Amino acid sequence: FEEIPEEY
Amino acid sequence: ADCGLRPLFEKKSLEDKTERELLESY
Amino acid sequence: IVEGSDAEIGMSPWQVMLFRKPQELLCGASLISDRWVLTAAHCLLYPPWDKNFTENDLLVRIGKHSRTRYERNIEKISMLEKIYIHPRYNWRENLDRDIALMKLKKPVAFSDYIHPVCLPDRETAASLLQAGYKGRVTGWGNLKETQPSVLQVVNLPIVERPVCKDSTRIRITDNMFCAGYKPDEGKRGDACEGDSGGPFVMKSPFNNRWYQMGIVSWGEGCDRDGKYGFYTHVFRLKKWIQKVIDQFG
Ligand SMILES: N=C(N)N1CCC[C@@H](C[C@@H](C=O)NC(=O)CN2CCC[C@H](NS(=O)(=O)Cc3ccccc3)C2=O)C1
Numbered sequence: 001f002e003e004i005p006e007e008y
Numbered sequence: 009a010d011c012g013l014r015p016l017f018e019k020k021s022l023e024d025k026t027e028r029e030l031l032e033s034y
Numbered sequence: 035i036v037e038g039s040d041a042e043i044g045m046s047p048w049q050v051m052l053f054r055k056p057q058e059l060l061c062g063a064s065l066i067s068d069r070w071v072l073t074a075a076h077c078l079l080y081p082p083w084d085k086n087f088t089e090n091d092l093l094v095r096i097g098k099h100s101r102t103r104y105e106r107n108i109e110k111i112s113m114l115e116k117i118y119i120h121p122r123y124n125w126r127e128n129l130d131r132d133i134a135l136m137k138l139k140k141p142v143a144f145s146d147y148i149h150p151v152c153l154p155d156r157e158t159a160a161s162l163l164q165a166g167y168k169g170r171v172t173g174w175g176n177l178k179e180t181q182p183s184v185l186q187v188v189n190l191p192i193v194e195r196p197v198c199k200d201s202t203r204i205r206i207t208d209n210m211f212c213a214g215y216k217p218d219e220g221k222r223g224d225a226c227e228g229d230s231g232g233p234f235v236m237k238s239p240f241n242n243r244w245y246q247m248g249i250v251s252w253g254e255g256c257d258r259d260g261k262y263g264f265y266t267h268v269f270r271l272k273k274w275i276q277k278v279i280d281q282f283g
Pocket residue numbers: 061076127128129204224225226227228229230250251252253254255256257262263264
């Protein structure tokens with residue numbers, strides 16, 4: 001999985 | 009309200025490539 | 035999905051990805067309002083497998099096309115506020131009442147790629163839920179008892195209850211329906227691992243709207259001859275759906 005925004 | 013009417017298909021009066029297969033079975 | 039094909043962009047804008055923050059794909063789900071997601075209870079809770087997911091364990095991803103890329107400017111990722119499992123979900127025997135509601139931390143915004151599906155009314159249900167009428171299933175699950183790069187779609191026929199019953203040892207309930215081609219039909223297709231919680235939808239010929247009739251629930255293997263996928267019967271549980279939203283959102 002391509003990493004997702006950290007804010008999430 | 010606006011449920012089940014797709015912005016890119018129903019709302020523009022375009023059909024997806026296999027939806028006739030559904031309708032044809034009814 | 036087995037023997038399906040790539041979805042078209044914006045073809046299933048109510049399709050949701052249940053994503054585990056290891057960060058892995060748990061199941062599909064469907065958007066029924068700006069704040070409510072529908073899924074399979076077993077996606078969250080399955081004691082035999084030691085599965086009991088909580089609000090803070092998951093992320094909901096909406097407007098997706100690709101299974102793994104973070105689709106910048108397209109998808110929206112929400113946090114769950116609360117999970118509701120059907121009080122009579124039967125995880126001990128047959129996954130009877132395999133349904134849950136997830137209320138989002140904040141209403142999502144509609145877009146070309148994010149739009150809710152309708153919930154059937156008794157009369158839509160009455161005329162569409164007929165043996166031989168086709169529905170559509172979508173997901174990012176296994177292709178084979180094996181993973182797509184993009185959302186897959188497959189159109190499948192509802193099969194007569196007796197045929198369903200006689201294909202398995204599990205005992206079937208009024209809260210389930212099964213779908214697939216019969217060995218004779220020379221057309222294949224089925225949901226597979228990772229598709230659970232996704233929508234089984236039909237397009238009404240009366241008002242040209244898409245209705246979610248079923249939820250990907252269970253089966254035995256994927257695309258086996260003489261076997262069929264089983265789905266939760268959304269209309270039979272609609273009462274419970276209303277409720278929760280009403281009694282809470
Ligand atoms: N449509 C199919 N052919 N499927 C069968 C293979 C993949 C399934 C999606 C999956 C996504 O999570 N659902 C399953 O894992 C739900 N479940 C949980 C326990 C094992 C069970 N399958 S089984 O063990 O063969 C038979 C069984 C079914 C119901 C309760 C217990 C036993 C199953 O289908 C659907």
